[PDB]
Design a protein around this ligand. Sequence first.
Ligand SMILES: *[C@@H]1O[C@H](CO)[C@@H](O[C@@H]2O[C@H](CO)[C@@H](O[C@@H]3O[C@H](CO)[C@@H](O)[C@H](O[C@H]4O[C@H](CO[C@H]5O[C@H](CO)[C@@H](O)[C@H](O)[C@@H]5O)[C@@H](O)[C@H](O)[C@@H]4O)[C@@H]3O)[C@H](O)[C@H]2NC(C)=O)[C@H](O)[C@H]1NC(C)=O
Ligand SMILES: *[C@@H]1O[C@H](CO)[C@@H](O[C@@H]2O[C@H](CO)[C@@H](O)[C@H](O)[C@H]2NC(C)=O)[C@H](O)[C@H]1NC(C)=O
Ligand SMILES: *[C@@H]1O[C@H](CO)[C@@H](O[C@@H]2O[C@H](CO)[C@@H](O)[C@H](O)[C@H]2NC(C)=O)[C@H](O)[C@H]1NC(C)=O
Ligand SMILES: *[C@@H]1O[C@H](CO)[C@@H](O[C@@H]2O[C@H](CO)[C@@H](O)[C@H](O)[C@H]2NC(C)=O)[C@H](O)[C@H]1NC(C)=O
Ligand SMILES: *[C@@H]1O[C@H](CO)[C@@H](O)[C@H](O)[C@H]1NC(C)=O
Ligand SMILES: [Ca+2]
Length: 1373
Amino acid sequence: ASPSINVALKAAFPSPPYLVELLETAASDNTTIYYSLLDRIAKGHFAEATTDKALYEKFLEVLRDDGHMDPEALSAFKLALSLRTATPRVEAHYQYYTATVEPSLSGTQEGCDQWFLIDGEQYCSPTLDTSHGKVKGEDQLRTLPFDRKFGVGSRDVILYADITSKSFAPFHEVAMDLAKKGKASYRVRYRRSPSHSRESLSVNGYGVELVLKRTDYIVIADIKPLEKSELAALGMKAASFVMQSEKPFEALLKLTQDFPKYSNSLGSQNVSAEFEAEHRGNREVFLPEGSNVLWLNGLHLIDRQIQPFGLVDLLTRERKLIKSVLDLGLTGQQAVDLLGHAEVAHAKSGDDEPRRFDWRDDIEEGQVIIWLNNLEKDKRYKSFSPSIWVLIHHFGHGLPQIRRDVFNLVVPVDLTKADDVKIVVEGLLSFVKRLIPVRFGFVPLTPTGQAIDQAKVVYYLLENYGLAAATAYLEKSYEEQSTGQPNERIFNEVIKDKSLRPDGVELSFKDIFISEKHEKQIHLSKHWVERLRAGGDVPTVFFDGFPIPREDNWLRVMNHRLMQDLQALQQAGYFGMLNESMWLPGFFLEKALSRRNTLIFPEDKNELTVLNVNKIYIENHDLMSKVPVIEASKESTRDDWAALTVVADLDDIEGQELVYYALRFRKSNDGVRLDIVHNPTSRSPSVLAQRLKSREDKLLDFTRFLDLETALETGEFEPDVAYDASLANFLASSNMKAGDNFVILNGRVLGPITSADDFKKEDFEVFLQAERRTRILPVYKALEDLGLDDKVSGPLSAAKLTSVTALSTISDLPQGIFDNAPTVRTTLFKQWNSTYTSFEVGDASTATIFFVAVINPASEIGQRWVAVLKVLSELEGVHLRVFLNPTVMIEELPVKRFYRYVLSSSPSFDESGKVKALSARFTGVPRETLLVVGMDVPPAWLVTSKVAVDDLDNLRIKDIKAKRGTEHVEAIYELEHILIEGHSREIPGAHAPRGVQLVLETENNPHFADTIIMANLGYFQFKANPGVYNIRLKEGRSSEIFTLESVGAKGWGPIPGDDNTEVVLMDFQGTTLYPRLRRKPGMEEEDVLEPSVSKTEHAEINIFSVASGHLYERMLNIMMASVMHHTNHTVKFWFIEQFLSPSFKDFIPHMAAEYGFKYEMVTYKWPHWLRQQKEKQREIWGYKILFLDVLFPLSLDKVIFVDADQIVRTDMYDLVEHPLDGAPYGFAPMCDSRVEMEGYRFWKTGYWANYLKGKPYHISALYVVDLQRFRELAAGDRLRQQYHALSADPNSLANLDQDLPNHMQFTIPIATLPQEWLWCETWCSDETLKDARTIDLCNKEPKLDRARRQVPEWTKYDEEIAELARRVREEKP
Ligand SMILES: *[C@@H]1O[C@H](CO)[C@@H](O[C@@H]2O[C@H](CO)[C@@H](O[C@@H]3O[C@H](CO)[C@@H](O)[C@H](O[C@H]4O[C@H](CO[C@H]5O[C@H](CO)[C@@H](O)[C@H](O)[C@@H]5O)[C@@H](O)[C@H](O)[C@@H]4O)[C@@H]3O)[C@H](O)[C@H]2NC(C)=O)[C@H](O)[C@H]1NC(C)=O
Ligand SMILES: *[C@@H]1O[C@H](CO)[C@@H](O[C@@H]2O[C@H](CO)[C@@H](O)[C@H](O)[C@H]2NC(C)=O)[C@H](O)[C@H]1NC(C)=O
Ligand SMILES: *[C@@H]1O[C@H](CO)[C@@H](O[C@@H]2O[C@H](CO)[C@@H](O)[C@H](O)[C@H]2NC(C)=O)[C@H](O)[C@H]1NC(C)=O
Ligand SMILES: *[C@@H]1O[C@H](CO)[C@@H](O[C@@H]2O[C@H](CO)[C@@H](O)[C@H](O)[C@H]2NC(C)=O)[C@H](O)[C@H]1NC(C)=O
Ligand SMILES: *[C@@H]1O[C@H](CO)[C@@H](O)[C@H](O)[C@H]1NC(C)=O
Ligand SMILES: [Ca+2]
């Protein structure tokens, strides 16, 4: 009965048959479920179900009966089935089939409804008698994302089937059995079924908004009553309403959906019921008022992840993780509590911190570093204060003088090499003389004979005679002899004078081979260099335990850290952490490691691989119950416990050397539990494994290495070929090759080990020390704090937990892209009092999923959150807890829209049994309020209106009732495109390649789409639908400079096996890519700078525009016509697709036939990083200026913008031919001609006249863009980053479209146009219009009035459109 508004969304592809959709949804990624169901339907089991409901009903019984799903999984199936998540996955098959299969399958197809493809041969019969062809085109045997494989087989078989018919069943069975035998491996691909109709797909999982477009007024329903002017209490009173209701869940939804309507209905409470001013004790501790925050098992989610699709994928990943944990007897509640524990999160923060290594002599008994300083005892610094407050009371870029030990620099130097020696002599000494507060040390490098001797020489000379004498030899040697061989002619001269009083123990003189001096000193030195990997082709310098390789300007790097370390000391001083009796260098050495291994501590910080340990001992039980195992000792403690597994090639020296070290390490550490895996031209071998398991008891009784070597040779054994099988499966699961050495401690993998000298006994010790710290100790404390320490029964038992919690903290989203914040699971909201602001839904005891929502009722973002969370709360095995936190800071109206979310937790069915389409229905809509319809769609989606007879930008029920006779409005949108978006990087010095051009292709067409790489995050996007695509760099400069190794389809990575350029989209989340591009031979080149096409493709003239109303669209029709009458040339029109009405959209082919022009619809989705516009008018303006380079195809040389309200009397070519004098775009200035208008000319004021020193204030109603130059100058990137930067201030750009080119005319040239090109009554005189080319209707007479009065021929154009519209309406086929 009530006046209603109904909005529905339909996809750009027809609805796949329901049967196939249920198969796909049902078997998400478990193949066994897939084929086990494929058998069931090939029985003809699902033939007796006539309707979608019946068919859906049948699947529930089947899944439950065959043990496939439990309550939790069944419930998750229903929601995912509602969402229609599997439909794009099925359409991927069809697009692939339509575009690559059909054109590469030459012949005459008759009876070939289904057909196997074997060895590029097609067989239309199960009997497999004859082959129709050698299939043309690329190999189809490529295993791609939507594939499934059944069985292992030398031969590869593919069946393209239309499952719907009965014709399928015999073909399936032919290859199912063939796979069961082992002849070949089976996989199914789809064929668009002609039994089904070409009806479009109805989607859900989006939101609709009804935005009030007049917000200015404030001091069933008619209009919202505006209330004076105590906004401040809205959130607070709104929060109470709910609490009071007692069915609170439903209240919030009912209140939050129609919130603008209930504003004046909240002025009454009656007295606020503010018991909950109590819970700002909650605010005082953790979150600021009016902030929306969601947590999923501790995981802090960003806004983009809060949609139905984003949330379904998170549960799927999360349950897999938790189920892994609860096989150890932990409740979902206990499991989550452990994952988000304080001690756990602390560890992640701890090793987010930068790492230092212990540069000290202490291990080498103070006989390796030869310091040129001592700041506490040098009698140079004697003058200076040895006070801490000297450090703390410092400001500037200068170095504070002090007599204290605080900064150290150790540089390893080769005394054979002149360049190396020069560093010490010139570099190091100046610094000493200069009284710098840094201690300078250096350790010689010993790689050759001469080097060994010269270390001895210098070391000796220091020991007896002193630093000055040693320095003296070095100085003299460098200038005098200029070589790294010891020179006595030079050496003896030094002793002659410098041999005065050599103190301490006396000099022995020449020659040197001291049993102690040569042995201990040189070998101790070698032990220092080896320990910190401070040698080789490129040596490593250590400043405050921070490695800086000896390259480029390392001192510049050192100085940067020197200041950064000083500021680190000062802040500890202001908090009073520091005290007078302290060794200051040890502030840095607190967390420093003794040994530096590039495997444990890779320079790529991200490089980390962890495996699920439980999985390893579950999948390969056959293998791991027969490997030589050294159990960790009977009498050792939980803290000592750790599990190690060594994978090595025992047929190689490196492989068996590595194991000896692991065995040695085990003798020392009684807590470790060791496993040995033989990997293996010999195949397998179970023999070598059997040789060791016999010696298992006697393991680590190997006094010498040959005892291990000999044990491998002796004994006669019978190969356990069952062992061999599980062995090769393990490596395949763990993604590791044959003859490769690896080390696994508590799930963490290091390798491949090329040389066993890289991983020694000392390396295992630090590996355990570091790993222990981070992963094991935080798990142990946390675990015990909860009292779950009963569940740990040994080293292997413990590894399952530690390995799982390490996998929990690895992000889905790379840090720095969507949010800078790390993957830290907080438990910090557990402190909060809950009685009067919280309510829970779902069983906490059973729940695997725990949601914590902190929603502000006054927020528009809250409207969406509530709606989505209610549907996810309906799922079994999910728990939700809600916190309401309003703000007292309300300067403007809080919620200015009505909201509806289209989503169901389980599918709905027709009276006919068909699946119910889901719609957003607003009932009891105010009759007098002007409303705007908006779509709040998931990030990967591109949406436009398809069916509507109303103005969605200007909705009023009273007008529709008075014009149409109906109080009911119905509109349909189309999900036209789904995004392929990615973040590029250059290799190896990873930077965003800007100006790079890309081409998206398909086998049908080699030019689907094209875009250019942006500066910010190497961002790019493509508009596509489900299917198989490829990304080729655009032929030209781009392919000349670069080669793209990969499209990052597997993740940020590189994940092995991703050296691919193929993209496929089979999800409603689109495709997220992280491509990599490496520069071709010796290039520092740039695309942007040099070393009739567009006309032919498009038109002589290319004009683009935008309109946001029926009036503005009516005026746009006139604009196009005026051009046409005024030019005997070819014109193409370009439009911003999503701002136009379907009435306009359905009309243009008719305008195109009449006026003889071509048209193309264009759009681009506003990037996630780029700053949004809440106000639609502002969005529109942004579209005209921010995306000029990326909105139009590369093939377009140039474009012209003409405003909707405009009219043109000129042949528009002239604007093309207008010389731009190397400028990217051309504009027309503001009229000075009107005499008395001055007052309102704001661009002659302080701000605009100071800024525009001499430059004009231009008009955005008309302009030329020399697109080739625009992109070449990379103007867009600059516009975008200046806009983003300026936009932080809300009052920054009054009219951005005009203001951005004007603000950028210093930076980006603007060609100025003759003013013959623009006329506006408001600012130009009437005398001017005789020579006027075009007219804008700039802004109290209305726009319709100005047109008729200002231009006499406006009516002539309007009549032409009017009769044609009627001619079309009266044209019925
Ligand atoms: C893809 O999905 C399918 C379907 O959910 C998963 O495949 C199922 O895997 C089961 C084993 O993991 C298998 O059941 C086995 O049946 C034999 C014969 O009775 C048992 O010897 C096995 O024992 C192992 O698993 C049990 C599990 O507890 C069960 O105990 C009794 C057994 O009678 C059941 O009544 C009870 O409900 C429990 O489920 C352990 O207790 C044992 O120690 C032992 O390790 C298995 O029970 C299923 O037949 C198999 N297929 C189907 C259709 O269910 C598959 O794992 C999954 N794949 C992935 C990648 O997730
Ligand atoms: C809120 O509600 C009503 C106002 O609507 C208050 O009650 C009124 O009390 C006066 C006497 O002080 C009576 O003359 C009115 O007739 C009452 N109104 C009604 C509708 O009964 C009430 O005191 C307010 N505050 C609280 C705590 O409820
Ligand atoms: C949660 O609420 C309790 C009250 O139920 C708070 O307890 C207070 O504790 C202090 C001592 O630490 C007492 O002197 C107060 O009287 C208590 N408050 C009340 C209202 O009685 C507790 O501090 C609150 N915690 C948080 C995090 O808000
Ligand atoms: C555009 O259209 C036509 C050419 O097809 C030109 O029209 C002719 O103009 C002369 C002089 O004004 C008339 O006497 C003829 O009768 C016209 N012929 C036709 C077929 O229209 C017109 O001048 C051209 N204008 C421009 C600007 O190119
Ligand atoms: C204070 O000085 C002592 C030595 O006297 C030192 O061990 C301690 O670490 C210093 N205090 C702090 C808080 O670090
Ligand atoms: Ca205008």
